[PDB]
Structures are given as C-alpha cells and as structure tokens.
Write an enzyme that holds these catalytic residues in place. Structure first.
Site, PDB file in Angstrom:
ATOM      1  N   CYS A   1       0.496   1.979   8.972  1.00 54.64           N
ATOM      2  CA  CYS A   1       0.274   1.927   7.526  1.00 54.64           C
ATOM      3  C   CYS A   1      -1.189   2.175   7.146  1.00 54.64           C
ATOM      4  CB  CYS A   1       0.741   0.578   6.972  1.00 54.64           C
ATOM      5  SG  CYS A   1       0.737   0.476   5.172  1.00 54.64           S
TER       6      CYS A   1
ATOM      7  N   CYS B   1      -3.055  -2.801   7.912  1.00 60.08           N
ATOM      8  CA  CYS B   1      -2.963  -2.493   9.341  1.00 60.08           C
ATOM      9  C   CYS B   1      -2.139  -1.233   9.599  1.00 60.08           C
ATOM     10  CB  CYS B   1      -2.355  -3.677  10.097  1.00 60.08           C
ATOM     11  SG  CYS B   1      -1.066  -4.547   9.156  1.00 60.08           S
TER      12      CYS B   1
ATOM     13  N   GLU C   1       0.821  -1.218   0.000  1.00 58.34           N
ATOM     14  CA  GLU C   1       0.000   0.000   0.000  1.00 58.34           C
ATOM     15  C   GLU C   1       0.854   1.266   0.000  1.00 58.34           C
ATOM     16  OE1 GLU C   1      -0.259  -3.215   2.259  1.00 58.34           O
ATOM     17  OE2 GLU C   1      -0.291  -1.478   3.609  1.00 58.34           O
TER      18      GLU C   1
ATOM     19  N   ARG D   1      20.333 -22.035  -6.550  1.00 56.02           N
ATOM     20  CA  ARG D   1      21.300 -21.558  -7.532  1.00 56.02           C
ATOM     21  C   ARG D   1      20.532 -20.751  -8.556  1.00 56.02           C
ATOM     22  NH1 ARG D   1      24.861 -23.692 -10.240  1.00 56.02           N
ATOM     23  NH2 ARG D   1      23.558 -25.126 -11.484  1.00 56.02           N
TER      24      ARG D   1
END
Lengths: 363, 355
Positions: free
Chosen positions: B82, B80, B57, B202
């Site tokens: 943020c 949450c 977000e 790898r």
C-alpha cells in the site's frame, strides 16, 4: 410596557446577586437584596448580613437618601411585618411575598395604601433557590437537609466498620467547607465524634475567592454543631465542644457531667430503642434551624434516608475500589423501604480534584 | 509557516473524523482515515471500513486519481502492499499523525516515502489518533486486548443493571453503542446461566449512527466470549444461536455438538481457577483488539484483581436499593482516575482509566 421588564430583570438579578453575599452569615434570617433605581441609575444597594444587623431595605435606604423619592425599589422578599414609605418611594418590585405567616402575607399591599405601585413574582424561582432552608422551615416545620456521603466506586466506605466518615480527598474536604459555611447547622452521630474526634468547623483558609466577597476572616460564622448521642458516649474533652460556637447534643437523658458554656442539650423521645430522627428535626425547626449539613457514617445516613428527611444527597466518589470487609451503606443492606422512600434525581455532577461529586435532590 | 500549521490541523482533524466512521466494523484492523489535498482543495478522502476491504489511502487515492499528483496526504496512521500506491501517485508531502506501533521496528513506513522525495512528518494530533485505536494499539504494543469493564449501580452500590434494567432506556441505548464498537464482549457463564442473554448489538437500539456508516446490513456482531471452566453453558442457550461467533474459554474440552460458529479456547488453570491473564494473552494472539465486559460481581472482581481492566464504565441509577440486589465486586484482597463523566437520561455514567 416592554423595556421596563427588560430593566426589571436586570436590577432584580442585581438584587439577587447581593442577597447571595449574605448566605454565610444571615441565619436564622433569610437572604435579602435590595436595589433602588432612579432614572436608569442605582442610587442605593443593600443586603441583609446578620440576624441583629439592619434589613436590606434599611441599608439601601440609608444609601439612597432623598434620591429615593423618585421611584422603583427592587426587593428579593416582601418587606414589612415602614421606612420604604417614609422615604417616599414610588414603584416597588418584590420577587416573593412572605412564606409562613400567611396571615401576614400581603404586607406588600401596605405600601399600596400609601399610593405606592407594587408587584411580585419576578424571578421568584431564583429567590426561592436563594432561601431553600428558611423557606422550608417556614412552610413545613422542618430544616432543609443535605446529606453528604463519601463512597468508593463499588459504593462502600472507610474499609472498616467504625462509623468514621471517609473524606476521600483534600479537594473534597475543601469543597465541603464551602457547603458547610452556608448551612445553619452541621449534624453528626456520636459514633463519628468518637471515631474521628473532629472539629466540624469552618476554616476560613479552606474557602476560596468567596474569601474576597463577604466573609472576611473576622465575620466567620461557625455553623451550629449537632451531635446525636443517646447513650452519652461523647466526652466534654472531645475536640468538637472546644471549638468556637455552640454545640448541641441530641441525647435521651440529661448528661450529669460539666460541659463548656457553649454546650447545649436537647432531650428527644425514642422510637424502637433508637432516638427519633423525625422528632429531632422538627425540634430543630422550633429552634429556628434553616438548614442542616450532615456528616454521617453508615447508620445515620441510612436512618435519615429511611425517615424521609433528606432533601439533598451530595455524594463524593473516590476513584477507588474497596474489599469485602469495607463497610459501605452500599453492598451491606440493613435498610428495607429505601426503594419506597422519597427518591432522588441527578442535578449536578462535577469533578472535584481526583473525585467526582454527584449532587442529588429528591425532586 | 503558521497558516500551514492551521491548514494541517484542519485536514488532520478531518482525517480523524473520517477514521472514526469505521470504528464499528474495522476490527481486527485499526481505524484509519486519509485526506488528500491538492493546492487547497480536498481531492480524495477515504477511511478503512473492514478487514476484507481496502485501506484508507487506497480509497482516497482512487478518488484523487490524477489529482493526487501535486501534493499533501493526511493519514491518521503511518502507511505500510500500500506504500507503492502513494509513491506511484506522486504526492509531495504526507503528514501522518502517528507512526506504526508494530513494533518500534516497523516505524520505517515514513522513511520509505522520504526516499521517494516525499516530505514526511509525524506527530500532528498523535493523541486523538491514539484515542482512535486504544485496543489495537495496546495489542500491538503489549499483546493484550484493551479491556473495558462496565458496571451498573444504584446510589447505594447495589448491583442495579437482565435487559429490564432498573437503570434506563437511555443507558441501555448507550451500552449498545459502546458494545457496537468493541471487538468482543466478554461474560461469565454465571451471567449466561442466570440471564440467558443474547449479548448482541441490536441495530434499532442505535440512533444517528444508524445513518453514519452502519446501515443494518453492515452490522458486525461483536465476538462473544464466555468463561466457563466447568462447561455449564449449553448449546441451546440464547448466546450461541445468535449471528456471529461465540468463543468458550474452557479449562477442558467440551464433548457436545456445537454450531459451526462456536469455538473453544483451552486455558490452563492457575491455582484452581482458569488463568485470566493467559486468556487475555490468548485473545491477543487471536487478534482481539478490545473487550467490553458484561458480567457479575465475581468476574468483575477477578479481572480487577488480575490487573487486566483498562477502563471502568460506571452507570449509576438515582435509585436507592438496599437489600434488593447485591454488590458490584467481590475483591478478596490497579487504581483509577476519572476521565469523562456525563448524564445518560436520568442516570450518570462515569468513565475511569487505569492511569
């Protein structure tokens, strides 16, 4: 030059789809489709249904009548060795040109003597696929062999030593019925007969929508049941011999008991204290068996794989894990030169109810 | 309102696609994607990349800037801090695929945004989003890592997959791919002593995902976890000299000097063996989302019998190997159902799930 081929592929496909309708009932004869075309319309269609029943060409010819004169008869397998000529056709298109005879392998040209335009090789691959077993018996002396296996995730079978075969699921059971039904024969070991007392028949009700197409109930053909019992342990009271259709025992010495009408017996030489599987196959070849579906326990499948006789593996895998005591052709070795025997490649994988089916061919 | 359902489906699909780009580098954080739409145009996109870096977000909001003002945000997980960032950039509408599972008391995220006059919903493609974070969601819900057990088999069940595998290049490439997205790889010391493996990803062995996220310099080596209750593994074995951490599940403290990147986890015994259940619990507290298990029969079996395997990945080779090399499990005694089955070169790979 161009649209002729476009149409050729259309009608041959059509002739191939008809030939298929016979795959359940046709043994020991091959599958054959025939489509007669005049001025962009099908005037006659046909496929071989049963060994004693008319050829595909006869069926289509009867249908077409005098409308055959015109041209273009599409066939799946070279005719003759006749009526196609007497019903004055022009052009004939064959997909294949006759396997074994080889001495008689261009009866395709017999029509050319009548001034009939001919040609072969159209979708020959597809017509090859259509008669895998028959064509194998002709070229080699050997029936075509499909080996069924019921395994768990960690290889392994049935949880117990008993050569009884694991069926894994009802869907896998239903799936096997369809594969059974197009086999000339079904093969098993006496151990499986003793451990399971099975019918090894086709049950019409367990087939699907191919119910609608050919194979109405009354036409149901029981694949020939083949039992390996060298030591004659199977009783005439076992379910298998009571089922409709023949059941052939591969035994070392002739059995002294009284067996039902349908019961036969093939005497087979040994090879290191065991019945010789290679000889038997070849023996079944002589006896006109195109294809065998094998319901094997651990020992049989291994012996077939080590004798290099299997053409196809069909592995049904149950989403289970099995314990140490579980038999399995798998973890439990026995065999030595499998790594050095005709190897297989994956061809098809599909869900089958809760199971998966892994379809493998030697290729 | 049906066309809106169609638009929502498109934009959430996109958010799910974006989230998927972080699946190699996001652990222990979930994969999260965001798409911001301003009357029909996408004005901000973002996904999570790494636990150190910003949330999806925040990325998307940074791209939208003033364009976020108008309306709708598509998030693949309830947001949450943020949540201020969303409220501060005055969106109308956020559409979350699923609510937070950490636990059912956390589900408040959406209610927070609704108070700000934002039109909220949840549940749209909450299933794809579920498939996006199997491990993380399982950990949050049940403090246990999602475990994937890999198995390699000949047609005759014999253990036939050690890099010179009798399987195939294609299958080796596939495993690398699947290793690459596990939080951790788990093995037994028995495999370490026998094979002396690196147990790493790898990067060259990867394909087109080379180009996606995952330039070589972003390579996140999955955490190596090794079970040796008898401390038989050595500090000179390949596995400890690899970039990234290796964690030893031990019954008793080792006394040797190990590199700084090595840890031990002290695990109680249960009737003579190291308690695998407690190890998984402890790997959970340690924030391990998911575990790709590369072992031998013994460990494959102990995990199976403990009820700890969430999925099986079974590679089968079209080889027949009778006496050559042993079986897949021991099982001195869950059950499974097939999910995807697929071809992998000349091999087949069969995926199975607990339920």
């Amino acid at each position: 030059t161009l649209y002729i081929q476009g149409q050729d592929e259309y009608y041959m496909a059509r002739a191939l789809k008809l030939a298929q309708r016979g795959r359940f009932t046709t043994h020991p004869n091959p599958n054959v489709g025939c489509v007669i075309v005049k001025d962009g319309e099908i005037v006659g269609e046909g496929y071989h249904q049963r060994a004693g029943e008319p050829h595909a060409e006869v069926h289509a010819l009867r249908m077409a009548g005098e409308k055959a004169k015109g041209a273009t008869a599409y066939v799946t397998l070279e005719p003759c060795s006749d009526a196609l000529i007497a019903a004055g056709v022009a052009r004939v298109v064959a997909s294949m040109q006759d396997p074994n005879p080889q001495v008689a392998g261009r009866g395709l040209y017999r029509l050319q003597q009548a001034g009939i335009d001919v040609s072969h090789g159209l979708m020959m691959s597809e017509a090859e696929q259509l008669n895998k077993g028959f064509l194998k018996r002709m070229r080699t002396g050997f029936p075509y062999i499909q080996l069924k296996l019921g395994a768990s995730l960690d290889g392994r079978t049935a949880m117990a030593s008993g050569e009884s075969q694991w069926i894994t699921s009802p869907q896998a059971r239903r799936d096997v019925q369809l594969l059974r039904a197009q086999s000339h024969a079904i093969l098993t070991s006496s151990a499986t007969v003793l451990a399971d007392d099975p019918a090894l028949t086709v049950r019409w009700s367990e087939l699907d929508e191919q119910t609608q197409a050919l194979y109405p109930q009354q036409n149901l053909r029981q694949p020939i049941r083949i039992v390996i019992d060298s030591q004659n342990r199977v009783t005439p009271v076992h379910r298998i011999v009571q089922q409709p259709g023949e059941t052939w025992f591969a035994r070392t010495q002739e059995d002294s008991r009284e067996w039902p009408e349908t019961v036969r017996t093939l005497l087979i030489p040994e090879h290191k204290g065991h019945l010789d599987l290679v000889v038997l196959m070849m023996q079944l070849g002589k006896q006109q068996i195109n294809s065998i579906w094998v319901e094997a326990g651990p020992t049989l499948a291994g012996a077939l794989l080590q004798a290099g006789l299997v053409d196809e593996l069909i592995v049904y895998i149950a989403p289970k894990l099995l314990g140490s005591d579980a038999r399995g052709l798998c973890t439990l070795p026995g065999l030595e030169k499998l790594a050095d025997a005709p190897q297989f490649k994956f061809k098809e994988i599909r869900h089958v109810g809760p199971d998966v089916c892994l379809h493998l061919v030697g290729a």
